[PDB]
Design a protein around this nucleic acid. Structure first.
Ligand SMILES: [Mn+2]
Ligand SMILES: [Mn+2]
Length: 183
DNA sequence: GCCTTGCCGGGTAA
DNA sequence: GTTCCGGCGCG
DNA sequence: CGCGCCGGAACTTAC
DNA sequence: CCGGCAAGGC
């Protein structure tokens, strides 16, 4: 607080499009990574990185933000035991998120993997328990939604946000000004 | 008539 | 998105 | 000696 | 993620 909104939003982006990795090497070497992947260097270097930078600074984390180019996407990586655990421990507590963290998380998750055309409002994931948590948050915010198994090939569910509540979902979650990068 | 949403394969962006 | 790789830092 | 950062990239597949 | 198709609702 109020790094907690930005944290929740980055967790959305990490859960969606990145990951939390604990490596073991030959030995007894190790590494802890916080990862967001994305195709464009804008929205990585210009939107995501400074949000991560802010948090790293607030949390006193000694590690660099690394931006590594791949053939198919960019990777924002923080190599840091402290931040790995910061985000992993937060994920464990996800059910206790307040409204601020709820909205920020759902915003980052949608950015990761929502339907971008917004002709339809859809979030895709294999993690059904995760989408069921988001579904209950959305019901509490008055945004009707259903979950079903969308992709039978990959075991990938969709949470479809009802277009009845289109304006409420876009207003309240997607174009939310909550917790900006910071005045 | 017009809108919404399940279904389901392609392949890009994870 | 995930996990290999070689290499360096630091008490 | 015993782990934890850095920079990359091959390898796979979930959006 | 994208997007065409067709069922089904008002
Ligand atoms: Mn994902
Ligand atoms: Mn994405």
């Amino acid at each position: 607080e109020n790094v907690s909104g930005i944290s929740a939003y980055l967790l959305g982006l990490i859960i969606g499009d990145g990951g939390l990795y604990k490596l073991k090497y030959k030995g007894n070497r190790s590494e802890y990574r916080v990862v967001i992947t994305q195709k464009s260097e804008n929205l990585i270097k210009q939107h995501i990185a400074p949000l991560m930078q802010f948090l790293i600074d607030e949390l006193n984390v000694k590690s660099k933000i690394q931006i590594v180019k791949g053939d198919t996407r960019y990777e924002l990586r923080v190599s840091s035991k402290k931040l790995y655990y910061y985000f992993a421990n937060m994920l464990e507590r996800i059910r206790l998120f307040n409204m601020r963290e709820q909205i920020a998380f759902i915003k980052g998750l949608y950015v990761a993997e929502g339907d971008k055309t917004l002709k339809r409002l859809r979030i895709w994931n294999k993690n059904k328990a995760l989408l069921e948590i988001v579904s209950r948050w959305l019901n509490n915010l008055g945004v009707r939604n259903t979950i079903h198994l969308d992709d039978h090939r990959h075991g990938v569910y969709v949470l479809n946000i009802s277009l009845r509540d289109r304006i409420k979902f876009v207003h309240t979650i997607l174009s939310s000004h909550l917790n900006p990068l910071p005045p």
